């Protein structure tokens, strides 16, 4: 639904790299370069953003 | 002055309309076969040890 606040495997906090991730992808950067530029070294953190599906943007579209 | 049976027909013709076959080219697929999954060029390590 919404970005997890901390990575499940190592509790690294990834809940503040969602908008930065989206901004570096709009600038032309690959998902690899983008996840690198955010400080996500070990692949347990990289999967936390790489495979996130933001469904809070589709629920926030039905009437109040 | 009536109609009488005449001589038996000597043959029969059966007509049908038919078109012909073209050359065998056998063009199986636009982009054919199962194209293989493959390596992204260079790639580079995306991880390092500590120290
Ligand atoms: Zn992690």
The phi and psi torsions of A21 (rounded to 5 degrees) equal -60, -45
Domain boundaries of chain A, sorted by first residue: 1-64
Resolution of the coordinates in A? 2.9
Nearest CA in chain A to B44: A32
A1-64 carries CATH number 3.30.70.100: no
- What residues of A form the annotated binding site? 7, 10, 44-45
Instruction: Identify how the structure was determined.
Output: cryo-EM
Task: Provide the token pair at A8.
Answer: 């499940």
- CA dist., res. A13 & res. B5, Å (int): 106
Task: Provide the token pair at A23.
Answer: 């901004």
Q: Is B36 helix (H, G, I), strand (E, B) or coil?
A: coil
Are the CB atoms for A18 and A25 separated by under 8 Å?
no
- Please write down the HEC assignment for all residues of chain A: CCCCCECCCCCCECCCCHHHHHHHHHCCCCHHHHHHHCCCCCHHHHHHHHCCCCCHHHHCCCCC
Nearest CA in chain A to B50: A41
- CA dist., res. A23 & res. A37, Å (int): 11
For A1-64, list the strands marked E by DSSP: none
Query: Which positions ≥6 away from B15 have C-beta within 8 Å?
Result: none
- Closest-CA distance, A53 to chain B, in angstroms, reads 23
């Amino acid at each position: 639904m919404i970005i997890p606040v901390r990575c499940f495997t190592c509790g690294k906090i990834v809940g503040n790299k969602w908008e930065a991730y989206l901004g570096l992808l709009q600038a032309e950067y690959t998902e690899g370069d983008a996840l690198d530029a955010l400080g996500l070294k070990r692949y347990c953190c990289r999967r936390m953003l790489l495979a996130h599906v933001d469904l809070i943007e589709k629920l926030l579209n039905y009437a109040p | 002055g009536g109609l009488t049976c005449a001589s038996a027909p000597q043959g029969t013709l059966r007509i049908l309309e038919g078109p012909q076959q073209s050359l065998s080219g056998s063009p199986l697929q636009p982009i054919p076969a199962s194209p293989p999954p493959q390596i992204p060029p260079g790639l580079r390590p995306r991880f390092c040890a500590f120290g």
